[PDB]
């Protein structure tokens, strides 16, 4: 699963409704060397290189998305649902990167809620960046999915989830993107990152 003893992703969708899901995770994982994807994110402070060093290594995951772009709007949303057995306040940083430069950093806070003898963190129907909405509307124009893939090889997201009070890193997920077909809806493959 995508998670640690301390925090687990329970669900993630980005979608549009005027529900079409561009990407959806509902909840022995393969390994990939983090060195392979250093040049996908900025090398300054808050870079994958210097984040993995600080540890803990077991908290770093890669998610590859085959996004469904078959659907001017519209409400454009992200929904995330995390859970834990300990009571925490989360800070969720999302850095949208184009050619390894950060073009958007979005910083959210979510306080734990008690539900069925576990703590849930609901960041539901958060409005998508104006930048992603515009990018999506242009991406959908492209005549060929090989062109959509060419444009996405340079487009990445890094989401760092911290224990607010302690600053302890809990989850670091790198996201990479291609496009799926219609008959073959959104798909993903979650990997663990190792050095």
Ligand X SMILES: *C(=O)CCCCCCCCCCCCC
Ligand Y SMILES: *CCC(=O)Nc1cccc(Nc2cccc(OCCCCC)c2)c1
By CB under 8 A, what part of segment 41-60 binds a copy of itself? 42, 44-46
129: contact with a copy of itself by CB under 8 A = yes
Calculate the CA dihedral of residues 136, 178, 50, 7 and round it to 10 degrees. 90
Check the CA dihedral 31-35-41-44 and report its sign.
Answer: positive
Consecutive H or E run containing 105: strand 101-111
Count residues binding ligand X (CB under 6 A).
13
Among 174, 151, 172, 179, residue whose Cα is nearest residue 39 = 174
Contacting residue, 66, 177, 186, 193, with ligand X by CB under 6 A: 177
Contacting residue, 126, 149, 163, 187, with ligand Y by CB under 6 A: 126
Per CB under 6 A, the segment of 24-32, 47-55, 83-91, 125-133 that binds ligand X is 125-133
* CA R_g for the chain: 16
103: contact with a copy of itself by CB under 8 A = yes
Of the chain, the end-to-end C-alpha distance in Å amounts to: 20
Contact yes or no for 92/158 (Cβ under 8 A): no
Interacting residue ranges for ligand X, rule: CB under 6 A: 14, 22-23, 67, 78, 94, 104, 106, 128-129, 132, 157, 177
- Under the rule (CB under 6 A), what is the footprint of ligand Y? 14, 22-23, 67, 78, 94, 96, 104, 106, 126, 128-129, 131-132, 152, 157, 175, 177
């Amino acid at each position: 699963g995508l998670g640690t003893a301390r925090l687990q992703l329970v669900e993630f969708s980005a979608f549009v409704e005027p529900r079409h899901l561009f990407v959806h995770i509902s909840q022995p994982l393969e390994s990939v060397d983090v060195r392979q994807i250093y040049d996908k994110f900025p090398e300054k402070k808050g870079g994958l290189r210097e984040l993995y060093d600080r540890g803990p290594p077991h908290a770093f995951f890669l998610v590859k998305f085959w996004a469904d772009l078959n659907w001017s709007g519209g409400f454009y949303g992200v929904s995330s649902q995390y859970e834990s057995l300990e009571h925490m306040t989360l800070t969720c940083s999302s850095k949208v990167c184009s050619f390894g430069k950060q073009v958007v950093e979005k910083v959210e806070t979510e306080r734990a809620q008690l539900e069925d003898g576990r703590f849930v963190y609901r960041l539901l129907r958060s409005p998508m960046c104006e930048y992603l909405v515009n990018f999506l509307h242009k991406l959908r124009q492209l005549p060929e999915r090989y062109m959509m893939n060419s444009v996405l090889e340079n487009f990445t997201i890094l989401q760092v989830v911290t224990n607010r009070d302690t600053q302890e890193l809990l989850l670091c997920t790198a996201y990479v993107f291609e496009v799926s077909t219609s008959e073959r809806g959104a798909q993903h493959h979650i990997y663990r990152l190792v050095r």
